[PDB]
Amino acid sequence: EERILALQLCGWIKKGTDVDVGPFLNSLVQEGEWERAAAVALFNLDIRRAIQILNEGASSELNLNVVAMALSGYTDEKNSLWREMCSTLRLQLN
Amino acid sequence: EERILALQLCGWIKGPFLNSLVQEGEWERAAAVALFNLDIRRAIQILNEGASSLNLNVVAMALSGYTDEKNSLWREMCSTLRLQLN
């Protein structure tokens, strides 16, 4: 409850017990800061929703599509070539 | 023997072809040629080098995604966005 109130104060959660980011999601979608919404959904744990958001953003305005193709590689193996490489290589992002 | 002769005439072999392609600057064609020879880490190295010489690193760390699972998100996503890429 204290965490809920803190998140509400932070602007992510609206009033009420309705824990649904669809309000902030649509607000960001109209706002145009697509990357921030993608990060928030990732925090909200909606991977395919973030994929749809990034694809729609690419429908707006190229690099985003390839970023999303990297995003489709969500693998949790401890001996990971994909994680051995992209984890270092992500530094080139702007 | 017929296949070897055909590939020799095709220009893929007379390594040296990889060096020639890298020198020519065709990072995309070089990476594709490597992948056609099934060397994933070589292709990743080539893509990173060409990126250092903001979409090439994106495609590189994306292609470093390799999933053999039937319904893995990687396969369907890359298939869908294969058309989208340029």
Side-chain angles (χ1 to χ4, degrees), chain B residues 15-16 25 30-32 34 43 50-51 60 62 65-66:
Chain B
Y66 186 21

mmCIF file of all heavy atoms in Angstrom, chain B residues 15-72, unseen atoms left out:
data_model
loop_
_atom_site.group_PDB
_atom_site.id
_atom_site.type_symbol
_atom_site.label_atom_id
_atom_site.label_comp_id
_atom_site.label_asym_id
_atom_site.label_seq_id
_atom_site.Cartn_x
_atom_site.Cartn_y
_atom_site.Cartn_z
ATOM 1 N N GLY B 15 38.064 -17.105 -46.817
ATOM 2 C CA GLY B 15 39.334 -16.617 -46.310
ATOM 3 C C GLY B 15 39.869 -15.438 -47.099
ATOM 4 O O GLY B 15 39.694 -14.290 -46.700
ATOM 5 N N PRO B 16 40.542 -15.719 -48.217
ATOM 6 C CA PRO B 16 40.944 -14.618 -49.103
ATOM 7 C C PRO B 16 39.755 -13.868 -49.671
ATOM 8 O O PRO B 16 39.804 -12.639 -49.802
ATOM 9 C CB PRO B 16 41.769 -15.311 -50.197
ATOM 10 C CG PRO B 16 41.713 -16.780 -49.915
ATOM 11 C CD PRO B 16 40.733 -17.042 -48.829
ATOM 12 N N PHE B 17 38.670 -14.578 -49.990
ATOM 13 C CA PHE B 17 37.449 -13.905 -50.415
ATOM 14 C C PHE B 17 36.873 -13.063 -49.287
ATOM 15 O O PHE B 17 36.363 -11.962 -49.521
ATOM 16 C CB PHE B 17 36.425 -14.930 -50.900
ATOM 17 N N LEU B 18 36.941 -13.566 -48.053
ATOM 18 C CA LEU B 18 36.472 -12.787 -46.913
ATOM 19 C C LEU B 18 37.292 -11.514 -46.742
ATOM 20 O O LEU B 18 36.737 -10.437 -46.496
ATOM 21 C CB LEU B 18 36.523 -13.634 -45.642
ATOM 22 N N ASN B 19 38.615 -11.619 -46.871
ATOM 23 C CA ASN B 19 39.464 -10.436 -46.771
ATOM 24 C C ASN B 19 39.163 -9.449 -47.889
ATOM 25 O O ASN B 19 39.104 -8.235 -47.656
ATOM 26 C CB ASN B 19 40.936 -10.843 -46.795
ATOM 27 N N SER B 20 38.961 -9.950 -49.109
ATOM 28 C CA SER B 20 38.638 -9.068 -50.224
ATOM 29 C C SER B 20 37.319 -8.343 -49.993
ATOM 30 O O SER B 20 37.219 -7.131 -50.220
ATOM 31 C CB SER B 20 38.593 -9.867 -51.525
ATOM 32 N N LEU B 21 36.297 -9.067 -49.531
ATOM 33 C CA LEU B 21 35.008 -8.441 -49.259
ATOM 34 C C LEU B 21 35.113 -7.420 -48.133
ATOM 35 O O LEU B 21 34.517 -6.339 -48.207
ATOM 36 C CB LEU B 21 33.967 -9.509 -48.922
ATOM 37 N N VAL B 22 35.865 -7.744 -47.079
ATOM 38 C CA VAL B 22 36.030 -6.805 -45.975
ATOM 39 C C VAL B 22 36.718 -5.537 -46.459
ATOM 40 O O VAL B 22 36.319 -4.422 -46.102
ATOM 41 C CB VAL B 22 36.804 -7.467 -44.821
ATOM 42 N N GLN B 23 37.757 -5.687 -47.285
ATOM 43 C CA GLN B 23 38.451 -4.523 -47.823
ATOM 44 C C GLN B 23 37.528 -3.690 -48.703
ATOM 45 O O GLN B 23 37.571 -2.456 -48.666
ATOM 46 C CB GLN B 23 39.686 -4.963 -48.606
ATOM 47 N N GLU B 24 36.682 -4.349 -49.498
ATOM 48 C CA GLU B 24 35.772 -3.622 -50.374
ATOM 49 C C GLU B 24 34.760 -2.790 -49.599
ATOM 50 O O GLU B 24 34.152 -1.885 -50.178
ATOM 51 C CB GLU B 24 35.044 -4.596 -51.299
ATOM 52 N N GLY B 25 34.568 -3.070 -48.314
ATOM 53 C CA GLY B 25 33.636 -2.329 -47.494
ATOM 54 C C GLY B 25 32.235 -2.894 -47.438
ATOM 55 O O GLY B 25 31.420 -2.404 -46.648
ATOM 56 N N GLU B 26 31.930 -3.917 -48.236
ATOM 57 C CA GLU B 26 30.596 -4.513 -48.264
ATOM 58 C C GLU B 26 30.429 -5.391 -47.026
ATOM 59 O O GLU B 26 30.521 -6.621 -47.071
ATOM 60 C CB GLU B 26 30.387 -5.302 -49.550
ATOM 61 N N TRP B 27 30.175 -4.730 -45.894
ATOM 62 C CA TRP B 27 30.009 -5.451 -44.637
ATOM 63 C C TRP B 27 28.790 -6.359 -44.678
ATOM 64 O O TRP B 27 28.822 -7.476 -44.149
ATOM 65 C CB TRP B 27 29.903 -4.465 -43.475
ATOM 66 N N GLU B 28 27.702 -5.899 -45.301
ATOM 67 C CA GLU B 28 26.496 -6.716 -45.373
ATOM 68 C C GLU B 28 26.728 -7.974 -46.196
ATOM 69 O O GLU B 28 26.396 -9.083 -45.757
ATOM 70 C CB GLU B 28 25.349 -5.899 -45.960
ATOM 71 N N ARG B 29 27.299 -7.825 -47.393
ATOM 72 C CA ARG B 29 27.544 -8.990 -48.236
ATOM 73 C C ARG B 29 28.553 -9.925 -47.590
ATOM 74 O O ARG B 29 28.423 -11.151 -47.686
ATOM 75 C CB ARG B 29 28.022 -8.553 -49.619
ATOM 76 N N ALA B 30 29.565 -9.370 -46.923
ATOM 77 C CA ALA B 30 30.546 -10.212 -46.248
ATOM 78 C C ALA B 30 29.909 -11.008 -45.117
ATOM 79 O O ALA B 30 30.170 -12.210 -44.967
ATOM 80 C CB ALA B 30 31.697 -9.356 -45.719
ATOM 81 N N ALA B 31 29.073 -10.358 -44.308
ATOM 82 C CA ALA B 31 28.405 -11.062 -43.221
ATOM 83 C C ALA B 31 27.480 -12.140 -43.760
ATOM 84 O O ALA B 31 27.407 -13.245 -43.205
ATOM 85 C CB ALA B 31 27.631 -10.072 -42.350
ATOM 86 N N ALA B 32 26.760 -11.838 -44.841
ATOM 87 C CA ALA B 32 25.900 -12.844 -45.449
ATOM 88 C C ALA B 32 26.716 -14.021 -45.965
ATOM 89 O O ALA B 32 26.309 -15.178 -45.820
ATOM 90 C CB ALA B 32 25.078 -12.221 -46.576
ATOM 91 N N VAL B 33 27.868 -13.746 -46.578
ATOM 92 C CA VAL B 33 28.697 -14.819 -47.112
ATOM 93 C C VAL B 33 29.208 -15.698 -45.983
ATOM 94 O O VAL B 33 29.263 -16.928 -46.109
ATOM 95 C CB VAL B 33 29.850 -14.240 -47.949
ATOM 96 N N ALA B 34 29.600 -15.083 -44.867
ATOM 97 C CA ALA B 34 30.012 -15.867 -43.709
ATOM 98 C C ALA B 34 28.872 -16.742 -43.206
ATOM 99 O O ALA B 34 29.051 -17.946 -42.995
ATOM 100 C CB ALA B 34 30.510 -14.943 -42.598
ATOM 101 N N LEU B 35 27.684 -16.157 -43.029
ATOM 102 C CA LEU B 35 26.550 -16.922 -42.522
ATOM 103 C C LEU B 35 26.187 -18.060 -43.466
ATOM 104 O O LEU B 35 25.715 -19.115 -43.025
ATOM 105 C CB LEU B 35 25.352 -16.001 -42.305
ATOM 106 N N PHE B 36 26.395 -17.862 -44.770
ATOM 107 C CA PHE B 36 26.172 -18.936 -45.730
ATOM 108 C C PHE B 36 27.186 -20.059 -45.554
ATOM 109 O O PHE B 36 26.946 -21.186 -45.999
ATOM 110 C CB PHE B 36 26.221 -18.386 -47.153
ATOM 111 N N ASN B 37 28.318 -19.773 -44.917
ATOM 112 C CA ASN B 37 29.281 -20.791 -44.527
ATOM 113 C C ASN B 37 29.096 -21.255 -43.086
ATOM 114 O O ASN B 37 29.872 -22.094 -42.618
ATOM 115 C CB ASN B 37 30.705 -20.269 -44.723
ATOM 116 N N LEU B 38 28.098 -20.717 -42.379
ATOM 117 C CA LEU B 38 27.724 -21.162 -41.031
ATOM 118 C C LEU B 38 28.840 -20.924 -40.010
ATOM 119 O O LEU B 38 29.315 -21.848 -39.347
ATOM 120 C CB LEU B 38 27.297 -22.632 -41.042
ATOM 121 N N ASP B 39 29.249 -19.662 -39.874
ATOM 122 C CA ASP B 39 30.195 -19.229 -38.840
ATOM 123 C C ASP B 39 29.570 -18.035 -38.125
ATOM 124 O O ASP B 39 29.698 -16.895 -38.580
ATOM 125 C CB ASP B 39 31.554 -18.880 -39.437
ATOM 126 N N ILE B 40 28.893 -18.297 -37.006
ATOM 127 C CA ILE B 40 28.109 -17.253 -36.354
ATOM 128 C C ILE B 40 29.018 -16.188 -35.749
ATOM 129 O O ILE B 40 28.793 -14.985 -35.931
ATOM 130 C CB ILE B 40 27.175 -17.867 -35.297
ATOM 131 N N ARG B 41 30.059 -16.611 -35.024
ATOM 132 C CA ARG B 41 30.936 -15.652 -34.357
ATOM 133 C C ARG B 41 31.741 -14.843 -35.362
ATOM 134 O O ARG B 41 32.007 -13.657 -35.138
ATOM 135 C CB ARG B 41 31.869 -16.371 -33.385
ATOM 136 N N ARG B 42 32.143 -15.464 -36.472
ATOM 137 C CA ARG B 42 32.807 -14.716 -37.535
ATOM 138 C C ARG B 42 31.898 -13.628 -38.088
ATOM 139 O O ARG B 42 32.330 -12.485 -38.286
ATOM 140 C CB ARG B 42 33.238 -15.665 -38.652
ATOM 141 N N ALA B 43 30.631 -13.966 -38.335
ATOM 142 C CA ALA B 43 29.682 -12.983 -38.846
ATOM 143 C C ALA B 43 29.457 -11.863 -37.841
ATOM 144 O O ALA B 43 29.355 -10.691 -38.220
ATOM 145 C CB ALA B 43 28.360 -13.663 -39.196
ATOM 146 N N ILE B 44 29.364 -12.206 -36.554
ATOM 147 C CA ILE B 44 29.192 -11.186 -35.524
ATOM 148 C C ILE B 44 30.401 -10.263 -35.488
ATOM 149 O O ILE B 44 30.265 -9.037 -35.370
ATOM 150 C CB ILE B 44 28.938 -11.844 -34.156
ATOM 151 N N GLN B 45 31.602 -10.834 -35.590
ATOM 152 C CA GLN B 45 32.805 -10.012 -35.622
ATOM 153 C C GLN B 45 32.782 -9.059 -36.807
ATOM 154 O O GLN B 45 33.078 -7.866 -36.663
ATOM 155 C CB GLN B 45 34.044 -10.903 -35.674
ATOM 156 N N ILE B 46 32.418 -9.568 -37.986
ATOM 157 C CA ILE B 46 32.395 -8.734 -39.184
ATOM 158 C C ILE B 46 31.371 -7.618 -39.038
ATOM 159 O O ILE B 46 31.627 -6.468 -39.415
ATOM 160 C CB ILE B 46 32.118 -9.593 -40.430
ATOM 161 N N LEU B 47 30.193 -7.939 -38.503
ATOM 162 C CA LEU B 47 29.155 -6.928 -38.344
ATOM 163 C C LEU B 47 29.585 -5.847 -37.362
ATOM 164 O O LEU B 47 29.372 -4.655 -37.610
ATOM 165 C CB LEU B 47 27.850 -7.578 -37.892
ATOM 166 N N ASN B 48 30.197 -6.240 -36.243
ATOM 167 C CA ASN B 48 30.677 -5.249 -35.284
ATOM 168 C C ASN B 48 31.760 -4.368 -35.897
ATOM 169 O O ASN B 48 31.766 -3.145 -35.697
ATOM 170 C CB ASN B 48 31.197 -5.946 -34.028
ATOM 171 N N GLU B 49 32.686 -4.971 -36.647
ATOM 172 C CA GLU B 49 33.737 -4.192 -37.292
ATOM 173 C C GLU B 49 33.156 -3.189 -38.275
ATOM 174 O O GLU B 49 33.527 -2.010 -38.264
ATOM 175 C CB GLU B 49 34.719 -5.125 -37.998
ATOM 176 N N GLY B 50 32.231 -3.636 -39.125
ATOM 177 C CA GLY B 50 31.623 -2.728 -40.084
ATOM 178 C C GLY B 50 30.812 -1.635 -39.418
ATOM 179 O O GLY B 50 30.765 -0.502 -39.900
ATOM 180 N N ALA B 51 30.155 -1.961 -38.303
ATOM 181 C CA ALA B 51 29.445 -0.943 -37.538
ATOM 182 C C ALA B 51 30.410 0.102 -37.001
ATOM 183 O O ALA B 51 30.106 1.301 -37.010
ATOM 184 C CB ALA B 51 28.668 -1.592 -36.392
ATOM 185 N N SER B 52 31.579 -0.335 -36.527
ATOM 186 C CA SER B 52 32.595 0.606 -36.072
ATOM 187 C C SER B 52 33.236 1.362 -37.228
ATOM 188 O O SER B 52 34.004 2.299 -36.988
ATOM 189 C CB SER B 52 33.668 -0.123 -35.264
ATOM 190 N N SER B 53 32.949 0.975 -38.466
ATOM 191 C CA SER B 53 33.520 1.640 -39.629
ATOM 192 C C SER B 53 32.428 2.137 -40.570
ATOM 193 O O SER B 53 31.338 2.508 -40.135
ATOM 194 C CB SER B 53 34.467 0.695 -40.369
ATOM 195 N N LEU B 54 23.688 3.894 -36.856
ATOM 196 C CA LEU B 54 23.503 3.160 -35.609
ATOM 197 C C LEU B 54 22.570 1.978 -35.823
ATOM 198 O O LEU B 54 21.873 1.545 -34.910
ATOM 199 C CB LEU B 54 22.952 4.079 -34.518
ATOM 200 N N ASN B 55 22.562 1.468 -37.054
ATOM 201 C CA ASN B 55 21.716 0.333 -37.390
ATOM 202 C C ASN B 55 22.510 -0.958 -37.515
ATOM 203 O O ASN B 55 21.937 -2.041 -37.343
ATOM 204 C CB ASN B 55 20.966 0.612 -38.692
ATOM 205 N N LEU B 56 23.808 -0.869 -37.817
ATOM 206 C CA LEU B 56 24.606 -2.075 -38.016
ATOM 207 C C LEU B 56 24.829 -2.817 -36.706
ATOM 208 O O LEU B 56 24.706 -4.043 -36.658
ATOM 209 C CB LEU B 56 25.943 -1.725 -38.668
ATOM 210 N N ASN B 57 25.146 -2.098 -35.628
ATOM 211 C CA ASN B 57 25.248 -2.751 -34.328
ATOM 212 C C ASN B 57 23.893 -3.288 -33.875
ATOM 213 O O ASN B 57 23.819 -4.329 -33.213
ATOM 214 C CB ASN B 57 25.820 -1.783 -33.294
ATOM 215 N N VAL B 58 22.810 -2.585 -34.215
ATOM 216 C CA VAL B 58 21.474 -3.058 -33.858
ATOM 217 C C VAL B 58 21.184 -4.388 -34.537
ATOM 218 O O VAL B 58 20.782 -5.361 -33.886
ATOM 219 C CB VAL B 58 20.419 -1.999 -34.220
ATOM 220 N N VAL B 59 21.418 -4.461 -35.848
ATOM 221 C CA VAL B 59 21.223 -5.709 -36.578
ATOM 222 C C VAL B 59 22.198 -6.776 -36.093
ATOM 223 O O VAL B 59 21.876 -7.967 -36.083
ATOM 224 C CB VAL B 59 21.355 -5.463 -38.093
ATOM 225 N N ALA B 60 23.402 -6.370 -35.677
ATOM 226 C CA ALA B 60 24.399 -7.335 -35.223
ATOM 227 C C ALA B 60 23.993 -7.997 -33.913
ATOM 228 O O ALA B 60 23.999 -9.228 -33.802
ATOM 229 C CB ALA B 60 25.752 -6.647 -35.067
ATOM 230 N N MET B 61 23.639 -7.198 -32.905
ATOM 231 C CA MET B 61 23.215 -7.775 -31.635
ATOM 232 C C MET B 61 21.835 -8.413 -31.756
ATOM 233 O O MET B 61 21.453 -9.241 -30.922
ATOM 234 C CB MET B 61 23.233 -6.715 -30.536
ATOM 235 N N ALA B 62 21.066 -8.039 -32.783
ATOM 236 C CA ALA B 62 19.832 -8.760 -33.063
ATOM 237 C C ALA B 62 20.119 -10.147 -33.625
ATOM 238 O O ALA B 62 19.555 -11.142 -33.158
ATOM 239 C CB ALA B 62 18.972 -7.955 -34.033
ATOM 240 N N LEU B 63 21.002 -10.230 -34.621
ATOM 241 C CA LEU B 63 21.332 -11.506 -35.243
ATOM 242 C C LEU B 63 22.112 -12.401 -34.296
ATOM 243 O O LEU B 63 22.112 -13.625 -34.461
ATOM 244 C CB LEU B 63 22.124 -11.275 -36.528
ATOM 245 N N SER B 64 22.774 -11.814 -33.298
ATOM 246 C CA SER B 64 23.327 -12.615 -32.212
ATOM 247 C C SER B 64 22.226 -13.332 -31.447
ATOM 248 O O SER B 64 22.514 -14.165 -30.580
ATOM 249 C CB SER B 64 24.142 -11.736 -31.268
ATOM 250 N N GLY B 65 20.967 -12.996 -31.730
ATOM 251 C CA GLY B 65 19.832 -13.778 -31.291
ATOM 252 C C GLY B 65 19.554 -14.934 -32.230
ATOM 253 O O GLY B 65 19.172 -14.733 -33.385
ATOM 254 N N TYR B 66 19.750 -16.155 -31.740
ATOM 255 C CA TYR B 66 19.589 -17.373 -32.530
ATOM 256 C C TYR B 66 18.810 -18.366 -31.674
ATOM 257 O O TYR B 66 19.344 -18.907 -30.703
ATOM 258 C CB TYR B 66 20.945 -17.935 -32.946
ATOM 259 C CG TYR B 66 20.880 -19.121 -33.884
ATOM 260 C CD1 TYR B 66 19.750 -19.371 -34.651
ATOM 261 C CD2 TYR B 66 21.956 -19.982 -34.008
ATOM 262 C CE1 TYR B 66 19.692 -20.452 -35.504
ATOM 263 C CE2 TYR B 66 21.908 -21.064 -34.856
ATOM 264 C CZ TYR B 66 20.777 -21.296 -35.603
ATOM 265 O OH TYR B 66 20.735 -22.377 -36.451
ATOM 266 N N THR B 67 17.552 -18.606 -32.034
ATOM 267 C CA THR B 67 16.674 -19.487 -31.277
ATOM 268 C C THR B 67 16.224 -20.643 -32.157
ATOM 269 O O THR B 67 15.714 -20.428 -33.261
ATOM 270 C CB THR B 67 15.456 -18.728 -30.746
ATOM 271 N N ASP B 68 16.414 -21.865 -31.666
ATOM 272 C CA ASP B 68 15.982 -23.063 -32.368
ATOM 273 C C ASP B 68 14.623 -23.567 -31.898
ATOM 274 O O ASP B 68 14.079 -24.495 -32.505
ATOM 275 C CB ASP B 68 17.027 -24.170 -32.217
ATOM 276 N N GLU B 69 14.063 -22.979 -30.842
ATOM 277 C CA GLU B 69 12.753 -23.387 -30.355
ATOM 278 C C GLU B 69 11.676 -23.074 -31.387
ATOM 279 O O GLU B 69 11.777 -22.110 -32.152
ATOM 280 C CB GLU B 69 12.432 -22.689 -29.034
ATOM 281 N N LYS B 70 10.635 -23.911 -31.407
ATOM 282 C CA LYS B 70 9.591 -23.759 -32.414
ATOM 283 C C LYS B 70 8.886 -22.414 -32.288
ATOM 284 O O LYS B 70 8.827 -21.645 -33.253
ATOM 285 C CB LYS B 70 8.588 -24.905 -32.299
ATOM 286 N N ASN B 71 8.387 -22.091 -31.100
ATOM 287 C CA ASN B 71 7.598 -20.886 -30.873
ATOM 288 C C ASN B 71 8.398 -19.798 -30.168
ATOM 289 O O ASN B 71 7.833 -18.930 -29.502
ATOM 290 C CB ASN B 71 6.344 -21.207 -30.065
ATOM 291 N N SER B 72 9.722 -19.834 -30.295
ATOM 292 C CA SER B 72 10.546 -18.805 -29.679
ATOM 293 C C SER B 72 10.251 -17.453 -30.309
ATOM 294 O O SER B 72 10.071 -17.345 -31.526
ATOM 295 C CB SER B 72 12.027 -19.140 -29.829
#
